[PDB]
């Protein structure tokens, strides 16, 4: 329902993006 | 490889794919079915691919001579970026390389979008 | 939400294209 | 606020801001609308901001690779100062920081003019 999905998704994208950055350094 | 070596290797890889197209024009087709100029990490590499596509569409050989002569005008490619592409060593089987350029591209687009999103959220 | 949705959708498409590739 | 701590804070804030620009190269337009290289406390950070401004005018990515490629090579940024900038944590909303960086720049300019006024008075 509503924009609940547009949080699971964005957060999904932010988690993937963060995963790729963390996997590029340190 | 640290992050720096990876970015340096993406740049190198683009040169090698493009060099291969200069030495074997017909590959522009198999490479284009995956890549657009927009997918190139180093912009001048993108403008080079963009000139080559245009040459191929009209059946004019893709070489140093024609790349320069038909080079845009409003937009140019620096002398060293040109030399660095032409001078890269052509390898066989650039399938992997082409795939890494496309992968790297999707990663960047994801990053741009990830930013823009957390940006509109203020 | 407006342009962001279109950007996420086209991004999603460039993604599945890599698999549809064959 | 200890004076030393403060200074260290200013240096740390400048990196986080520069590190943030590396994460979202578009943020350089906003930051530049309030900051010039000369406004950075630690000179190497200003030099960095400078190369970045140049890289963005050429639409070239601002990353570890190109920052090191576009370095003046007559003048260079010591590796420790680079890893300092690249390793710092990109924050969300570096606004206050940018205005903080600008504020301390103005203070230093205030202090400089104060000294030339004192010096050029004691003939």
Numbering used by the authors:
A (entry chain D): 98 to 123
B (entry chain A): 1 to 122
C (entry chain C): 101 to 122
D (entry chain B): 1 to 123
How do the authors describe this structure?
We determined the structure of NTD of HpDnaB which is highly helical with a compact head (N-globe) and a long helix (H7) at the C-terminal end. The asymmetric unit consists of two complete monomers and two short peptide fragments. Interestingly, the two complete monomers form a dimer which is stabilized by the two short peptides and it eventually appears as a heterotetramer. In a dimer, the two monomers are arranged in a head-to-head manner where the C-terminal helices are extended parallel to each other. The two short peptides form helices, which are arranged in an anti-parallel fashion with the extended C-terminal helices (H7) resulting to the formation of a four helix bundle. The electron density suggested that these peptide sequences are similar to helix 7 and MALDI (Matrix-Assisted Laser Desorption/Ionization) analysis of crystals confirmed that these are degraded peptides of helix 7 from NTD itself. The dimeric interface consists of 29 hydrophobic residues that bury 3410.56 Å2 of solvent accessible surface area. The head-to-head dimer organization as seen in NTD of HpDnaB is different from other homologous structures known so far. However, the NTD of HpDnaB construct has a half of the helix hairpin (Helix 7) which does not allow the formation of four helix bundle as seen in the structure of MtbDnaB. Surprisingly, we observed that the NTD of HpDnaB shows very weak binding to HpDnaG primase compared to NTDL and HpDnaB, suggesting that N-terminal domain needs to be in a proper conformation for interaction with HpDnaG primase.
